[PDB]
Amino acid sequence: SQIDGFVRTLRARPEAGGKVPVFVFHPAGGSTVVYEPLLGRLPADTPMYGFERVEGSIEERAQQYVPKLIEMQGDGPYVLVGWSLGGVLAYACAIGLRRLGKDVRFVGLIDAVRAGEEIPQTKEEIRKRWDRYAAFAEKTFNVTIPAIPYEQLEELDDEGQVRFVLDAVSQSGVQIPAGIIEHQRTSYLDNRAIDTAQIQPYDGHVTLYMADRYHDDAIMFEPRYAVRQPDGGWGEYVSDLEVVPIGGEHIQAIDEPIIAKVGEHMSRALGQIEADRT
Numbered sequence: 001s002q003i004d005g006f007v008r009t010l011r012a013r014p015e016a017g018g019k020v021p022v023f024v025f026h027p028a029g030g031s032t033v034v035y036e037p038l039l040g041r042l043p044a045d046t047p048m049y050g051f052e053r054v055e056g057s058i059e060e061r062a063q064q065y066v067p068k069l070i071e072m073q074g075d076g077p078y079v080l081v082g083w084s085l086g087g088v089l090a091y092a093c094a095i096g097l098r099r100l101g102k103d104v105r106f107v108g109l110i111d112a113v114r115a116g117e118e119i120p121q122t123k124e125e126i127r128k129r130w131d132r133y134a135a136f137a138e139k140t141f142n143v144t145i146p147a148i149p150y151e152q153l154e155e156l157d158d159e160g161q162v163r164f165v166l167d168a169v170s171q172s173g174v175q176i177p178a179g180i181i182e183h184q185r186t187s188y189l190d191n192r193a194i195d196t197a198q199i200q201p202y203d204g205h206v207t208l209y210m211a212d213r214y215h216d217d218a219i220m221f222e223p224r225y226a227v228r229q230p231d232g233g234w235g236e237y238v239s240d241l242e243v244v245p246i247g248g249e250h251i252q253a254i255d256e257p258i259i260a261k262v263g264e265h266m267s268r269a270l271g272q273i274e275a276d277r278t
């Protein structure tokens with residue numbers, strides 16, 4: 001995998017012609033190398049490019065990706081796919097591309113499932129979330145995370161909360177590798193980017209590959225992900241939603257054997273698109 005800006009080449013397209021590329025978008029706290037199992041289950045010579053992390057709200061991230069998508073693929077067709085946060089990013093790009101008159105053929109959400117219940121916007125919720133992260137950081141890094149004063153919780157947005165903790169961490173003098181600090185920073189913000197995403201309507205085909213449940217660690221961070229709606233929270237927004245059950249838990253959906261089901265279904269979709277453009 002070669003990287004150029006925020007674009008990872010997972011399989012380069014031929015010099016000219018060839019099949020429609022699959023554009024995959026990174027998950028919360030990971031890179032697009034996670035899509036290599038999927039690529040192994042897609043038709044031979046299917047190109048694939050991964051869009052890695054950029055800063056901003058979902059819409060601001062899409063505003064950086066959509067111009068690059070068009071630079072690479074022009075009028076279309078567009079195949080946009082993502083697990084975790086990448087599914088929301090793929091969906092946001094599909095909306096932007098459609099608004100610009102581009103040809104989007106397939107949006108693939110790999111268990112990018114909304115919380116079954118609205119997350120309240122209270123200091124109590126912010127507190128519990130940061131204490132759950134403090135517990136995660138102890139079980140994981142055996143490190144003590146500082147806590148934000150209760151009456152300052154609603155004075156800090158997500159970025160500001162993370163900045164507060166990172167500074168107080170370095171001011172506390174705990175030894176944490178910077179590489180872990182940066183992975184933790186992006187994982188926290190990207191998980192919150194899923195939490196706070198506002199889904200816009202999309203008049204187009206979307207396939208939701210739906211696992212059985214979020215895994216325990218996800219539910220420990222935010223228990224409202226223990227509940228799932230049958231449409232994963234997407235039915236009110238998508239005119240043509242196809243829900244493909246894949247079993248397993250959210251963390252397993254990206255890897256074998258669960259990804260074989262995703263690849264088998266997506267390969268048929270890709271074969272139809274290739275036939276349709278020929």
Ligand SMILES: O=c1oc2cc(O)ccc2c2oc3ccc(O)c(CN4CCCCC4)c3c12
Nearest residue numbers: 129184187188191192194195217218221222225
């Ligand atoms: O799940 C997580 O893993 C992490 C793994 C890390 O290394 C670091 C941070 C986090 C992390 O910070 C979060 C903040 C809010 C929050 O709601 C969640 C739950 N997440 C929401 C999106 C859907 C799956 C569950 C997290 C979450």
